[PDB]
Amino acid sequence: AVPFRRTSKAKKRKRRTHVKLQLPGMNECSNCGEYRLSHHVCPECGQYDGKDV
Amino acid sequence: YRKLGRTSSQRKALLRDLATDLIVHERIETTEARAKEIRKVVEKLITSGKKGDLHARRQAAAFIRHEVVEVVQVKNRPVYALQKLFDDVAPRYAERQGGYTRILKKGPRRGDGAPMVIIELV
Amino acid sequence: MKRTYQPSKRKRKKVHGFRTRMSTKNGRRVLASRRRKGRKVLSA
Amino acid sequence: VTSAKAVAKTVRIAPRKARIVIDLIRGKQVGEAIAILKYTPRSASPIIEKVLKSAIANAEHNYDLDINNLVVEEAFVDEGPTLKRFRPRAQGRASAINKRTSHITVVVSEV
RNA sequence: AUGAUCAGGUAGAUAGGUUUGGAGUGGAAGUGUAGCGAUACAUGGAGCGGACAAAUACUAAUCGAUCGAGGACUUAACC
RNA sequence: GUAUGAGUAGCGAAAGAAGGGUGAGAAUCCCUUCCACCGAAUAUCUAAGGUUUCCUGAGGAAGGCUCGUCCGCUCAGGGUU
RNA sequence: CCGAUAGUGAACCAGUACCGUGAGGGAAAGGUGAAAAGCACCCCGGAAGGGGAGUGAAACAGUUCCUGAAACCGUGUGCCUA
RNA sequence: UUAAGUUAGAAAGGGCGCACGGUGGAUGCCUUGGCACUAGGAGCCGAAGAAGGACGGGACUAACACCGAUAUGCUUUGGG
Ligand SMILES: [Mg+2]
Ligand SMILES: [Mg+2]
Ligand SMILES: [Mg+2]
Ligand SMILES: [Mg+2]
Ligand SMILES: [Mg+2]
Ligand SMILES: [Mg+2]
Ligand SMILES: [Mg+2]
Ligand SMILES: [Mg+2]
Ligand SMILES: [Mg+2]
Ligand SMILES: [Mg+2]
Ligand SMILES: [Mg+2]
Ligand SMILES: [Mg+2]
Ligand SMILES: [Mg+2]
Ligand SMILES: [Mg+2]
Ligand SMILES: [Mg+2]
Ligand SMILES: [Mg+2]
Ligand SMILES: [Mg+2]
Ligand SMILES: [Mg+2]
Ligand SMILES: [Mg+2]
Ligand SMILES: [Mg+2]
Ligand SMILES: [Mg+2]
Ligand SMILES: [Mg+2]
Ligand SMILES: [Mg+2]
Ligand SMILES: [Mg+2]
Ligand SMILES: [Mg+2]
Ligand SMILES: [Mg+2]
Ligand SMILES: [Mg+2]
Ligand SMILES: [Mg+2]
Ligand SMILES: [Mg+2]
Ligand SMILES: [Mg+2]
Ligand SMILES: [Zn+2]
């Protein structure tokens, strides 16, 4: 329950190959022209589905 | 149904509170699952108000919290959440069958990244 | 758990005080050696 | 003349937690990179956002470049001076805690 | 467990609601009658009814974005 | 002085919810309503001990097992008849 | 004879801070520049911190500030790798 | 077209070489402080209150140094 040998740099980086984070799922608001998340209310013009919220 | 991180008595008290603020304010901001659960309760309550009996009124009063919405110059007596539910909210949806509420997603909270929404009855 | 140090002002000054040191040949020895080393507080 | 840069020296966030967000905006147009940083829910995003906007501003003012034709040329995170703290464990011993800092650098150039 | 798998995204019954049901519990509230009263009887297999069934676009699956081929050489048979 | 274990163990008994306000920034600060917990105590005094931790106006580097616009933290003036 | 792990424990507010009821034990910590001439003014930011401008022989001398090795952490790429 | 055969290429990530940074404080140079001695001097202070301290004194004063309610100092004799 305690490491027998220290971990080399190659093995550490190989383990960290999957420890990234993905890219946000966004597109452009039709009214704004600005970026926003899909299926969300855009924070700039405060509209969703062509109607003001 | 879903357990919301709290036991049966605490969960029931959370649902009675949230279903009352939606009646009084008509628009509140909460989290995702916490909104997807009160969606059902508020609509069952509005159906009870739609019936409009005395049996229905008592059955709804067994769930509404007893708090004042606003005081009116009727002698100036206040009105309560049950009165508003049976006199204002329920007559609005006389010609509507279901779906008295909608949920609009907003985005994560700074403190803990919780996905917040807005639930509002129209 | 009752711990080992239970403070008291009187019980401190009556055992470790200056007059208690100065009342004995060996207490005066202690004061002399602390003056020799150069300490800021003697006895106390 | 063609590139501008801005650094944030000794920010309190730890380097390993900021590199994971830096690795997202590398080699991307600034208009898209700002939105990338705005919609990702991490604590390092506001710091990198401020650094990137500072770099864009002093590209536009000092060297008179076109905003719409800028890309994130290079972005990296360096170690800073760490602060040494302690945490009292059980049975009378203490354990070390490192409050690490970082330096964040971003460079914008035309493409 | 999370990925994954499967059923769907207005070319819609995918989830919630609404309307009918069903299991389950067992005779609701209000009013009336009998009794001094606890209580009993009627209206009435009544009322309630998470997760089960069928209908129904009322609410949410809007709008968009990303990835993804033009196919090496040699020989062998009609060619 | 700096690594590996590793973004891993832990974050120290407990019920919170929404609406307004402040602010560059709010689950965490202020106000309101509802809910909940102790109640031979988790209430009120008072010795020992501590020694300014008390109050007001500013502050957000470090301390606070998260955040902080807040604090028994930082700065400056007061306060014990 | 030493030259900042050396030489007194102490080249710096050292028998100090801290530890112990007490007697007692007992550290770490030097260097901008010849001269503060210690960055007016503009820009991003709440600030910190930066990019210009200026002083200076030097700012890659900007308040652990002469020199600045190794461990350690990164960015880019020439050859190889399921 | 089909059949049989042969060989390229690839990088989610990694290895080696090089270039450029960050952290860290070694090495070089320097001296404010020490160590060991030589020649000379001096080898005691106190009831006329000692050695050592506490509290105070500045326009602003937390600390060092100086001073003592005559308190960041008073009188006099010389130097400048
Ligand atoms: Mg209970
Ligand atoms: Mg599909
Ligand atoms: Mg349905
Ligand atoms: Mg149909
Ligand atoms: Mg039945
Ligand atoms: Mg493990
Ligand atoms: Mg855990
Ligand atoms: Mg806790
Ligand atoms: Mg709140
Ligand atoms: Mg109780
Ligand atoms: Mg009891
Ligand atoms: Mg006292
Ligand atoms: Mg204490
Ligand atoms: Mg204090
Ligand atoms: Mg206070
Ligand atoms: Mg803070
Ligand atoms: Mg904090
Ligand atoms: Mg304080
Ligand atoms: Mg040196
Ligand atoms: Mg030394
Ligand atoms: Mg002590
Ligand atoms: Mg110098
Ligand atoms: Mg500045
Ligand atoms: Mg250099
Ligand atoms: Mg020099
Ligand atoms: Mg090096
Ligand atoms: Mg590589
Ligand atoms: Mg002699
Ligand atoms: Mg003698
Ligand atoms: Mg004179
Ligand atoms: Zn918009």
TrEMBL record, chain A:
GO BP annotations listed: translation
Cross-referenced InterPro entries: Ribosomal_bL32, Ribosomal_bL32_bact, Ribosomal_zn-bd
GO cellular component: large ribosomal subunit
MF terms (GO), sorted A to Z: structural constituent of ribosome
Highest taxon listed in the record's lineage: Bacteria
Keywords, comma-separated and alphabetical: Metal-binding, Ribonucleoprotein, Ribosomal protein, Zinc
Coiled coil, from the record: none
Pfam families xrefs: Ribosomal_L32p
Residues that hold Zn(2+) according to the record: 29, 32, 42, 45
NCBIfam families: rpmF_bact
Xref: PANTHER family: 50S RIBOSOMAL PROTEIN L32 (PTHR35534), LARGE RIBOSOMAL SUBUNIT PROTEIN BL32 (PTHR35534:SF2)
UniProt similarity note: Belongs to the bacterial ribosomal protein bL32 family.
Protein name: Large ribosomal subunit protein bL32
Organism: Listeria innocua
From TrEMBL, chain B:
Family as reported in the entry's similarity comment: Belongs to the bacterial ribosomal protein bL17 family.
Protein name: Large ribosomal subunit protein bL17
GO MF term set: structural constituent of ribosome
Subunit record text: Part of the 50S ribosomal subunit. Contacts protein L32.
Source species taxonomy: Bacteria, Bacillati, Bacillota, Bacilli, Bacillales
GO CC terms in record: cytosolic large ribosomal subunit
InterPro entries membership: Ribosomal_bL17, Ribosomal_bL17_CS, Ribosomal_bL17_sf
UniProt xrefs under Pfam families: Ribosomal_L17 (PF01196)
Gene Ontology biological-process entries: translation
Entry keyword set: Ribonucleoprotein, Ribosomal protein
TrEMBL record, chain C:
GO molecular function terms listed in the Swiss-Prot or TrEMBL record: structural constituent of ribosome
Keyword Ligase: no
Residue stretches spanning the membrane: none
Region described as Disordered: spans on this chain: 1-44
Regions of compositional bias (Basic residues) in chain numbering: 1-19, 26-44
GO biological process, one term: translation
Gene3D superfamilies hit by this protein: 1.10.287.3980
Cellular component per GO, a single term: ribonucleoprotein complex
UniProt cross-references to InterPro entries, sorted A to Z: Ribosomal_bL34, Ribosomal_bL34_CS
Protein name, UniProt field: Large ribosomal subunit protein bL34
Organism listed in the record: Listeria innocua
Gene from which the chain derives: rpmH
UniProtKB/TrEMBL annotation, chain D:
Gene: rplV
PANTHER family, alphabetized: CHLOROPLAST 50S RIBOSOMAL PROTEIN L22-RELATED (PTHR13501), LARGE RIBOSOMAL SUBUNIT PROTEIN UL22M (PTHR13501:SF8)
One GO cellular component term: cytosolic large ribosomal subunit
Keywords linked to the UniProt accession: Ribonucleoprotein, Ribosomal protein, RNA-binding, rRNA-binding
HAMAP family listed in its UniProt record: Ribosomal_uL22_B
Pfam families: Ribosomal_L22 (PF00237)
NCBIfam families cross-referenced by the UniProt entry: rplV_bact
Record bears the keyword rRNA-binding: yes
Keyword presence, Iron: no
Name by which UniProt lists this protein: Large ribosomal subunit protein uL22
Subunit structure: Part of the 50S ribosomal subunit.
Family: Belongs to the universal ribosomal protein uL22 family.
Cited function: The globular domain of the protein is located near the polypeptide exit tunnel on the outside of the subunit, while an extended beta-hairpin is found that lines the wall of the exit tunnel in the center of the 70S ribosome. This protein binds specifically to 23S rRNA; its binding is stimulated by other ribosomal proteins, e.g. L4, L17, and L20. It is important during the early stages of 50S assembly. It makes multiple contacts with different domains of the 23S rRNA in the assembled 50S subunit and ribosome.
One GO BP annotation of this record: translation
Annotated GO MF terms: rRNA binding; structural constituent of ribosome
